[PDB]
Subunit: 143 residues, 3 copies
């Protein structure tokens, strides 16, 4: 049965090297550390970030490729098992040179500076599996 | 005296079922679990979200009703006692189909997908009470 | 060697008094508590916030001074040692009266209401030092 309750595992705060692709780095970090489930938050600046808006009727993301440096105002997301490997899902809000904000699901983004907080969670299974929506999701917590 | 310092209670990470109203679900979750104080963060997609901008002179929120699916880029907020019951206060940033971001206080929002992190805090009282501003707030932490 | 791994120290949730400058208050809070490293998140409303977009070629921030009340939709950031003192680095997303969002690095902001979560981290050194970019950054975590 899903309870949604976990214990607090390992805790991290780090700067991602310039030039990494953020999602890739966080995945590789978790592989190295043996992290399966976590929550993430962070800030910094990304270059040429690609964001996504899900199109429910098409069962895929509309990908919007931005150009140049954007302030990474928020990154919020999670790490969870998908097809046997840690999988990173995050959304971002990005600031342009006039302070206007774009955002959505993070598809990819090259790091200029990224200061990430990562909190591992330990407990029951919480795995992304295919759904009718065309999204890979966890089993819901039904009250 | 207010110290603002708490111990870490129970920790949760879950997907909220499609069709729940997000604030309502988080409140009902906390009622079930006996959670009084917590911090929340999450992502996903909401449908027809209503956001609020507080009008200080009127002592009420201006409510802006959005339509359709918006990417839930950030949800950040907290749970605390108000009038004897757990009460959910959160702000959201929402992405539209072109990747432009709207946001404010979350008034209500129907969940398509919502992946929420919730960290219970244990300690001294931290209760929302009426103020001259027309906002229900905690006693401040004066340095 | 950088590991990026820390233990969870003291945990806090508080309302910042009306009229404080947010970054200043969080710094002074950490000085009082003897906090050197932490992660922060919060919401509320700021008045006349100033945001920044970094100009890499100029090695400085372009400062955009906003006016009036903005909903503080997200504050995400961290506290770390810089030149011997706790130093606060945060990014914000701010909502205007029509629900449009501005944001970037937080340069300064007067608090109307600010509900901040702060989690101290204990462990290895994590200090902001000058870099060729003109940003004060931690030593990166190279996988």
């Amino acid at each position: 049965m899903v309870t949604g309750m976990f214990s607090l595992g390992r805790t991290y705060l780090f700067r991602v090297p310039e030039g990494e692709e953020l999602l890739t780095y966080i995945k590789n970090f978790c592989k190295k550390e043996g992290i399966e489930t976590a929550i993430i938050n962070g800030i910094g600046t990304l270059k040429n970030p690609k964001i996504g808006y899900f199109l429910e009727e098409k069962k895929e993301y509309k990908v919007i490729p931005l150009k140049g440096s954007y302030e990474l105002i928020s990154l919020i997301g999670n790490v969870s098992l998908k097809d046997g490997e840690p999988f990173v899902h995050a959304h971002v809000s990005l600031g342009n040179e006039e302070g206007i904000v774009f955002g959505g699901h993070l598809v990819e983004g090259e790091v200029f500076v990224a200061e990430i907080f990562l909190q591992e969670l330990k407990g029951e299974k919480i795995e992304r599996k295919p759904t009718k929506y065309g999204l890979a999701l966890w089993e819901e917590l039904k009250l």
